Design a protein that fits this description.
mainly beta, Cathepsin D, subunit A, domain 1, 2 domains, six-stranded mixed beta barrel, about 40% strand, globular, binds the ligand N#Cc1ccc(COC(=O)[C@H]2C[C@]3(CN2)C(=O)Nc2ccccc23)cc1, binds zinc ion, peptidase activity, disulfide bond, cell membrane, cell projection
Amino acid sequence: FVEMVDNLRGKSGQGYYVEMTVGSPPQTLNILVDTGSSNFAVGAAPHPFLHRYYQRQLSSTYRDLRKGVYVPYTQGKWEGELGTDLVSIPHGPNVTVRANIAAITESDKFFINGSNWEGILGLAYAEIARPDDSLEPFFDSLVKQTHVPNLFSLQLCGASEVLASVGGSMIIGGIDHSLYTGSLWYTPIRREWYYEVIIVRVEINGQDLKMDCKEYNYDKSIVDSGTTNLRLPKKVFEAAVKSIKAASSTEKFPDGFWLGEQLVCWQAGTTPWNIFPVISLYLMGEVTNQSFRITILPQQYLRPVEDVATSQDDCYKFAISQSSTGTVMGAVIMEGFYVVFDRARKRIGFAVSACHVHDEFRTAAVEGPFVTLDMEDCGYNIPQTDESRSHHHH
Ligand SMILES: N#Cc1ccc(COC(=O)[C@H]2C[C@]3(CN2)C(=O)Nc2ccccc23)cc1
Ligand SMILES: [Zn+2]
């Protein structure tokens, strides 16, 4: 898997993207790797924020599906024309796949100025593909047309006139043991739409937040590489911030800091890491009543930004934010861990990332098992609307 190692790039907080070619002749595009979605889609017309885009009509292998598509996120929104074409990853498997592609023709708050990506690779399941689950997602097609094992793994590596470059690896088709240390612990995928998982317990510096564990997973908990922050449901976010405020309280930051909207700085090299607590999420084990914990440092949740105007300082952004659609384990979480999307056995593994940022006193950790007698159910059941209910699945 050496040729796939380090095949991701980007700018800190703006998404990791992989290089892909679409069409014949091949057009190269930098594509956001996003496990929080299931569409493959590329900018397909000019845009202030795009250097380039996919030109359907310059590809001899393009087939129009004569079908339109619309995907609204909440923070985002794009639409386009559905088609298929030949697709490959230069720093991936040595294969070419015919896959569905959405040619994006209009968008809003989707593309990111400076991010250097021109599309999105949705690696989640067909259930959340648009317009429906009959649109075969990229990964399904790849596994189905080639011999590629039904598994991929992600190692995202965290970091004056530009934001910091990041590097990552997406290993398509297996697990590169050089990308982690220690044990790989697996949590069941609750349902196959998002990479939904179940958190059973949260600790801030050893201290249990003591909430009904259902609050952790309200209304779901997902692993999303295409989300920058660790995002937490309102109740959970407030309790977590309270505890972090409290451990870090020899330092009094502005509201805007905790709201993720403002940098705080120290003299270069003098950041008092150790006044910031570790955060541990306990995840449901493969064995009933078992859990393991993934433990991140302030080096994951405190995100470096070089101030143009105080460039002599180390400055940081708080990259834990509030959610109203559940817990999102975003890059902040992922950048502690080598994460294994084991679709074949319907599970997600975490191990300590050989590239995670740490210090001489603490590291990100993956630890288990932990055991609960008569463990309750921490899963939430999303209310079923009539729209959703009325859909057939043939
Ligand atoms: N019909 C639908 C449908 C499908 C999936 C989702 C959920 O999509 C995600 O979570 C993806 C997309 C993402 C980050 N991850 C986002 O939300 N905005 C944004 C902006 C830019 C890049 C990536 C993203 C919501 C609705
Ligand atoms: Zn029917």
